[PDB]
Amino acid sequence: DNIVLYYFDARGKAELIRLIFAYLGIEYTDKRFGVNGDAFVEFKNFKKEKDTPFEQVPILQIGDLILAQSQAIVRYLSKKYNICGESELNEFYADMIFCGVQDIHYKFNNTNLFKQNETTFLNEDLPKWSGYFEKLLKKNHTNNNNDKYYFVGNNLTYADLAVFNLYDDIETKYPSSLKNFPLLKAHNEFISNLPNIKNYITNRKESVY
Amino acid sequence: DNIVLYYFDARGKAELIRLIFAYLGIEYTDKRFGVNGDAFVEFKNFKKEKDTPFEQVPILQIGDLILAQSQAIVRYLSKKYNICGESELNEFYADMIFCGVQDIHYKFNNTNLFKQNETTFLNEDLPKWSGYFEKLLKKNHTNNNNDKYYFVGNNLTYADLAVFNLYDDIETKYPSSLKNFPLLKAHNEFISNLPNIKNYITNRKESVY
Ligand SMILES: CCCCCCSC[C@H](NC(=O)CC[C@H]([NH3+])C(=O)O)C(=O)NCC(=O)O
Ligand SMILES: CCCCCCSC[C@H](NC(=O)CC[C@H]([NH3+])C(=O)O)C(=O)NCC(=O)O
Predict the structure, then answer these.
(1) Paired residues of A31 in beta bridges
(2) Beta-carbon separation of A209 and B115 below 8 A
(3) CB-based contact A136:A78 (threshold 8 Å)
């Protein structure tokens, strides 16, 4: 019943978990390797002290329970705290959308810092994937038109937070990315303004990734 | 004419070229996109005004001559200014070493920052590749012992500078990485203390990569 999240000092694959905790107002210890200096030694000492299944982070520890694999952690958390949808179909859709997010998020990460194929990403990959998500929001649109935007049903799911996080990452590095996608831009403003998320984000230190 | 080097605000693909210019004492303009605001917009405006063969940087402009492709630029510069060996065979060896540096450099860049496969990089690939270079260094032993270390022949080549740049970069992240490779470490210290290089490095700005 004591909750601790371990990861490096970065958003990366731990950020959606932090967002979920913030949304749900669950208190926990956000352990970031390297805050005490020397990320290498901490992570090394961490693998000695804790029984990780694949020697990787994020690791979420609940009391004595070691949980690994960010995706599995996200899905487990979401079922326990009721943001995994209201039906079996919607649970699937939230899941499907989260997997879609992983596809572009991966590409975004591979291009933003190194500028690797930045032009191809910004001209082909990004608008195509943003178009996919725009169309999903649209298919779910008259599930609350009153400035509430959800990808799945009439309630918030981890998919909303996952898409938020993704486009939160993208519009900062690439301002006005959302301008051609009105539903997606609105969705990003909506969830970003939810008080718990609004407070987490303003309190959130800047980071390289 | 005026030499202008065009790249993003980073070491990456341009640094070796800058090291060659520093080493040779060649004056040029080091134009860096995105020093002040969003590199992608500046790069976009650059391609509109400049005819590049592949719409990518680095670009080296000498007069109205436009040169693209970092590796080809290095070789051209190195042949022009006599740091490419002194026999057809040593010219090949410098080239071979450079290509080897690119294999390991790519791995270091792909795993540093994100930590994707860090322990694989650290316990397998880096030591392996460090051993390759150490071994190549030993093979050039007769090409003196007199506190001078070269990979090829008995004069500095761009391969020396490439290997330097490779471990200068790695040593930032993993500072003890050359403790088991004393000849490689001495090599690295020797290059870094050449007056033109020492000077360029002290004055060099810090970067994420
Ligand atoms: C933008 C984020 C992309 C970067 C991915 C790297 S996350 C850090 C890395 N862990 C993983 O790759 C975990 C992947 C796993 N599939 C998950 O989702 O948790 C690690 O423990 N690294 C330490 C090591 O391998 O030694
Ligand atoms: C760790 C450093 C390695 C990062 C690789 C990307 S360097 C920037 C990129 N250019 C290239 O990929 C050039 C590759 C070419 N083979 C070279 O070596 O010059 C670019 O112009 N990008 C802009 C664009 O595609 O729009």
Answers:
(1) A6
(2) no
(3) no
| Residues B92, B77 share a domain | no
Alpha helical stretches, state H, A81-194: 88-112, 118-120, 126-139, 158-173, 182-193
> Which resolution, in Å, applies to this structure?
2.2
From B165's Cα to the closest Cα of chain A, the distance in A is 17
Task: Please identify which residue in the block is written with the tokens 């005819």.
Answer: B51
Residues A169 and A95 in one domain: yes
Structural domain boundaries, residue B178: 84-209
Instruction: Please indicate, yes or no, whether residues A99 and A126 belong to a single structural domain of this protein.
Output: yes
Of B8, B40, B208, the CB nearest to A122: B40
Of B83, B110, B141, the position where a domain reaches its end is B83
- List the determination method: X-ray
Helices (H), B53-181: 70-80, 88-111, 118-120, 126-139, 158-173
Tokens of B194: 């050449």
Instruction: Specify the number of domains making up chain A.
Output: 2
| Cα A93 to Cα B86: distance, rounded to the nearest angstrom | 65
B38, B115, B208 member nearest A113 (Cβ): B208
B116 touches chain A (CB under 8 A): no
Q: Mark whether B76 and B88 lie in a shared domain.
A: no
